[PDB]
Design a protein around this ligand. Structure first.
Ligand code: NAG
Ligand code: ADE
Length: 251
């Protein structure tokens, strides 16, 4: 009994994409906020109501249903046709609890960015945009077989992970995509450092006082790699849509 959200690439526009992201942001059901920024639930372990299904379909009707964790917006697995695939690191509760009545498989690689790079999918060389998304859905469906190609699944999920999860977390990434929607673009050093620092930013923001000062600054990068440090909430607030609930200092 999960919540579901749909997005079709057929006749898709930058507007249908943004409306989709905001529908997802709502269904993740964050609880409360920190400094005005929505704060994702700290705990939600029951697979029966701790995942949101994102139904992605392309112009040809091919469909891929992605399972996303409501506490982290983490993609743990997906279903295509009558089959389901899960990242090697997907917890047992989810593997057993999600996508029942499907032929289940556990991928031989994790869902983290470095695990995906092990399957040749690198953020720096993977195109993002509506066409890259149509192709990703197409590939996931084409690989709804026993002898699937892990490199195709990895690159396709890398596109999905950033266009859905990262964009849902960061308004900055959402707009990099929105204003490049009908084009193919690769994330730069700015987009990549944000993606990498979501946890640290989330912890420093939540634990800061009314003045918003971070106890420890967070290093980010400009498009060209030049580093800069975020030392206050307001310095990054306009770039974030959702905050992760982080307990201990992450690192
Ligand atoms: C980071 O900036 C360098 C130039 O300073 C550039 O060559 C590189 O492609 C950038 N990283 C990415 C993947 O955007
Ligand atoms: N599988 C995944 N889901 C969501 N965000 C991610 N960032 C890196 N890997 C991810």
């Amino acid at each position: 009994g999960l919540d579901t959200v749909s997005f079709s690439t057929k006749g898709a526009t930058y507007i249908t994409y943004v409306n989709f992201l905001n529908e997802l942001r709502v269904k993740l059901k964050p609880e409360g906020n920190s400094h005005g920024i929505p704060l994702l639930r700290k705990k939600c372990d029951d697979p029966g109501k701790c995942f949101v299904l994102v139904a992605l379909s392309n112009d040809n009707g091919q469909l891929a249903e992605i399972a996303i964790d409501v506490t982290s917006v983490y993609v743990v697995g997906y279903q295509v046709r009558n089959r389901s695939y899960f990242f090697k690191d997907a917890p047992d509760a989810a593997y057993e609890g999600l996508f029942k009545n499907t032929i289940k498989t556990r991928l031989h690689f994790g869902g983290s960015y470095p695990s995906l790079e092990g399957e040749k999918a690198y953020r720096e060389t993977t195109d993002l945009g509506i066409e890259p998304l149509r192709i990703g859905i197409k590939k996931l469906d084409e690989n709804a077989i026993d002898n699937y190609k892990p490199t195709e699944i990895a690159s396709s999920l890398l596109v999905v992970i950033q266009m859905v999860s990262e964009a849902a977390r960061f308004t900055f990434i959402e707009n990099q995509i929105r204003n490049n929607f009908q084009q193919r673009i690769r994330p730069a050093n700015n987009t990549i450092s944000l993606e990498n620092k979501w946890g640290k930013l989330s912890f420093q923001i939540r634990t800061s006082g009314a003045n918003g000062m971070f106890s420890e600054a967070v290093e980010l990068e400009r498009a060209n790699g030049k580093k800069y440090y975020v030392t206050a909430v307001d310095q990054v607030k306009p770039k974030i849509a959702l905050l992760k609930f982080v307990d201990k200092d992450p690192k």
